[PDB]
Amino acid sequence: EVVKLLLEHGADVXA
Amino acid sequence: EPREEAGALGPAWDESQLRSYSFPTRPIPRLSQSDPRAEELIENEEPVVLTDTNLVYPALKWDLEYLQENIGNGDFSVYSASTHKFLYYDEKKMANFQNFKPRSNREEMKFHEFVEKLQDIQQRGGEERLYLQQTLNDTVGRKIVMDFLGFNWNWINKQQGKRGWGQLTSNLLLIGMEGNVTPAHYDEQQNFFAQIKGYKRCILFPPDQFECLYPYPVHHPCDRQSQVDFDNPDYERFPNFQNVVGYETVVGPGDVLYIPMYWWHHIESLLNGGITITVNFWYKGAPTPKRIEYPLKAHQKVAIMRNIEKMLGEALGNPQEVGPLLNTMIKGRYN
Ligand SMILES: O=C(O)CNC(=O)C(=O)O
Ligand SMILES: [Zn+2]
């Protein structure tokens, strides 16, 4: 869990 | 070294149209879409400029006259700035840094109004700068729908398949004044950057140069942008900016630049080069693999850092407590 939790990324782009 | 346009039309541009910076760089490879090396690069998430994809071949005829006549009567986001540097900011996040005075305002307008504004500014020899950046949507005219449908979906969909990427999330349409600069930042999506009108200098830095580029805090409105002013680097605050090395290129009409996820990029419209038009293609990155493999890749450590900052934000009940806690954690303990 931990690592998979810490590895997840958002999808933030640009502006 | 500048590329010679077909028909003996001289050099497309020259070095004097490039702004000058303190760091060295090396060229991003320009290759054919059919060259296996270009595939190895994309597979390895390293930048590459593809010269012959025809990704947006129908758009190569776009100019302001054509678009104004065809892009519909929807609303277009247009950014203003009193300088060549368009530092952007997340509006939602402006609550928790009230000592933050913006450098660029956003304004909604009709396309024809944006064209008028450019016309005006040139006529009156003004210095204000505009930059249109608007997601393509339903409200566009029939001719634009046809152009869009004419993009090389066969090619890019295969790329999305081979890389196990997620869905296309959007296409940003970017129309910018000569000399305009988008300062160094990174994006959390894979990007195929398709150049249409004019020339853009792109300087890229790998994820493993996080240490040299000093991003704002995650909760700051300028989250994901470098704090370093490339025109006047403060080496006392940002000492490792002295070790930065860029990958650079100039893209013109027909060129596609693969900007891999998490790679920093600094982008400028050549001085005295006219307006520029780009359309980008943003894909969500492949999923986190079932089995993690150590040592971690640099973009994965950037993922982790972002998450630590986010969680402490929630946990402490206030993002402004994040810094003090982090310093308490390391001082005399890990430094
Ligand atoms: O083209 C520009 O000025 C800026 N574009 C980006 O940062 C991007 O497409 O991710
Ligand atoms: Zn970007």
Q: Which of B137, B131, B36, B151 lies closest to B84, judged by CA?
A: B131
Which residues pair with residue B267 across a beta bridge? B182, B202
Question: Cβ distance B284 to B168 under 8 Å?
Answer: no
CA gap B41, B55 in Å, rounded = 18
CA of A13 to the centre of ligand 2 (A): 6
Is the beta carbon of B277 within 6 A of some atom in ligand 1?
no
Residue among B79, B282, B307 minimizing CB distance to A13: B282
Rounded-to-integer distance, Cα B256 and Cα B159, Å: 13
CB-defined contacts A:B, below 8 A: 49
Q: How many CB atoms lie within 10 A of CB B36?
A: 9
Give how far Cα B247 sits from Cα of B56, B113, B143, B250, Å: 24, 37, 37, 11
The set of residues, in sequence order, having a beta carbon less than 8 Å from that of B75 and lying 6+ positions away, is B108, B109, B110
Would you say the C-alpha torsion B216, B222, B224, B230 has a positive or negative sign? negative
Per DSSP (E only), the strands in chain B are 25-27, 30-31, 48-50, 76-81, 106-109, 129-135, 168-170, 172-176, 181-185, 190-197, 200-205, 246-251, 256-259, 264-269, 276-283
Q: How many whole angstroms separate alpha carbon B283 and alpha carbon B165? A: 7
Cβ under 8 Å to B: A residues 1-15: 3-15
Whose tokens are 């493999």? That residue is B293
Asked if B199 and B271 touch (Cβ cutoff 8 Å), the reply is no
Q: Which domains does chain B have, with CATH numbers?
A: 1-291 (2.60.120.10), 292-335 (1.10.287.1010)
SS3 content of chain B, % helix, strand, coil (to 5): 30, 25, 45
Nearest-CA residue for atom 8 of ligand 1:
A14
Classified as helix, coil or strand, B302 is helix
What is the experimental resolution, given in Å to one decimal place? 2.7
Handedness of CA B166, B167, B169, B175 (dihedral sign): positive
Residue nearest to atom 9 of ligand 1 (CA): B280
Query: 3-state DSSP call for residue B50?
Result: strand
Q: Is B223 close to A10, i.e. CB distance below 8 A?
A: no
Distance B278 CA to ligand 1 centre (A): 9
- Whether the CB-CB separation of B192 and B258 falls below 8 Å is answered with yes
DSSP B227-273: ---TTS--TTT-GGGGG--EEEEEE-TT-EEEE-TT-EEEEEEPTTS
What is the enclosing helix (H) or strand (E) of B51?
none
What is the distance between the alpha carbons of residues B216 and B288, in angstroms, rounded to a whole number?
A: 25
- What the block records as the tokens of B7 is 């028909």
In 3D, which of B143, A12, B45, B88 has the Cα closest to residue B307? A12
Three-state secondary structure call for residue A7: helix
Q: How far is the CA of B191 from the centre of ligand 1 (A)?
A: 9
Q: Is B169 on the interface with A (CB under 8 A)?
A: yes
User: For B141, what's the count of Cα atoms within 13 Å in the CB-facing half-sphere?
Assistant: 10
> Which residue's C-alpha comes closest to atom 4 of ligand 1?
B182
Binding-site residues of B for 2-oxoglutarate sit at 131, 182, 191, 200, 280
Q: Which ligand is nearest to the CA of B133?
A: 1
Cα→Cα distances B215→B35, B198, B226, B241, Å: 35, 29, 4, 12
Residues of B within the annotated binding site for substrate? 138, 167-169, 187-189, 224-225, 286, 307
Q: Which of A1, A2, A3, A6 to mutate to test the interface with B (most CBs of B within 10 A)?
A: A6
Work out whether strand B256-259 and strand B48-50 pair parallel, antiparallel, or are unpaired: antiparallel
CB B283 within 8 A of CB B187: no
**Residues B94, B102: Cα–Cα separation, whole Å:** 10
Cis-peptide into B295, omega within 30 deg: yes
